Amino acid sequence: NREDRKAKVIEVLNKARAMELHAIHQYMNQHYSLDDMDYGELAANMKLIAIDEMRHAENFAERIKELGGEPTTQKEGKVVTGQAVPVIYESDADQEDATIEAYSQFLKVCKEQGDIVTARLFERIIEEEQAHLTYYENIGSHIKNLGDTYLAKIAGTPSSTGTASKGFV
Amino acid sequence: NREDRKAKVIEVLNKARAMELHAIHQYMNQHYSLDDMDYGELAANMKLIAIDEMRHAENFAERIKELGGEPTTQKEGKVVTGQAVPVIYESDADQEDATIEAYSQFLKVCKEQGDIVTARLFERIIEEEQAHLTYYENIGSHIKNLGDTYLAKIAGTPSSTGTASKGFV
Ligand SMILES: [Fe+2]
Ligand SMILES: [Fe+2]
Ligand SMILES: [Fe+2]
Ligand SMILES: [Fe+2]
Questions:
Q1: In angstroms, rounded to a whole number, what is the distance separating the alpha carbons of residues B118 and B69?
Q2: Which of A17, A23, A110, B133 sits between 20 and 30 A of A33, alpha carbons compared?
């Protein structure tokens, strides 16, 4: 059953990939809103987390290619726009939490299909999702508990995420 | 699983093909010996059957390609040389019989893999193997019952299998 094992892993890898593509767009939308509001540090860290999901999306596609499949290019679920700051961190924490639940199941399938390399990929990525979760939880906890005295400190901070995107041009 | 289905059919097609490649060499070895003994009619029909086996190998190969596989180039088992005339026909009948039994199982697998085209290819080739089996049993029977009287009639007969092989030069 070589082919069935391959096919079954590719299916969860494409499920996870589509979840990554949704998070990229969702986090970046919130990044545009945070920058607009001039809350630099929140905006910078939101983009940096979106870049992590980009890297997750890339790794899932590379493994899908190694297994003979085709990486999906459609995002899972819909992006929510116009979210308020308190809503941003509460939904993002919920979404990371849900992501770690789904990936843990995906991990299950990989082990069931005797795929150690893909299982380890999900294991590695779950640890990074956990860092995202803690991040969004903490911010959400400060927002709830301290409100505007917390935000006054973020106002006007730098939004820079480092040297610009090394690209082609 | 589409790919799994194909993989299992390709497996039995390469098993059958390896069996054909064995038969080509076994039968041609006997053709060379019958030609050497100057039993022309026997040598001629041995080669014509070897050529039927070449066409079977070719048809298995082409179906293997349509399925995206690679046709094997190794024969199954070893060629037996130095067989006496009665042994040639006794063993060729046993091999043809063994082949029909195997192909009949291979045909079953194709149906299990929902592969109608490959199953029909097996059914067609099995009927030809039945023609071969019947031929070898008939000759074996004349040799057993008629001895050197039958051979005396075959000595000095034409060995020609027709016009030369349309080839490149
Ligand atoms: Fe991710
Ligand atoms: Fe994440
Ligand atoms: Fe054959
Ligand atoms: Fe045959």
A1: 13
A2: A17
First CA to last CA distance, chain A: 46
Resolution (A): 2.0
The alpha carbon of residue A77 and the mean position of all alpha carbons in its chain are separated, in whole angstroms, by 14
**Buried b / exposed e along B13-24 (16+ C-beta atoms within 10 A):** bbbbbbbbbbbb
Total count of domains within chain A: 1
Residues of B within 8 A of A6 (CB-CB) are 3
Whole-number Å distance between alpha carbons of B13 and A10: 28
d(CA A146, CA B43): 101
Distance from CA of B121 to the nearest CA of A (A): 25
From ligand 1's centre to the CA of B96, what distance in Å? Answer: 60
CA B137, chain centre distance (Å) = 15
d(CA A150, CA B71): 70
Considering only CA atoms, which of B60, B134, B130, B138 is closest in space to residue B100?
B130
Rounded to the nearest angstrom, the distance between the alpha carbon of B8 and the centre of ligand 3 is: 20
**How many other CB atoms sit within 10 Å of the CB of residue A156?**
11
Check CB contact under 8 Å for B1 and A2. no
Cβ(B63)–Cβ(B16) under 8 Å? no
Give distance in angstroms: CA of B38 to centre of ligand 3.
26
Q: DSSP secondary-structure letter at A67? A: T
CB within 8 A of B92, min separation 6: which ones?
A: B26, B27, B30, B132, B136
Q: Provide the CATH number for the domain around residue A51.
A: 1.20.1260.10
* Contact between B18 and B72 (Cβ < 8 Å): yes
> Are A6 and B7 within 8 A, CB to CB?
no
Residue located via tokens 């935000």: A151
Closest by CA to A14, choosing from A65, A82, A85, is A65
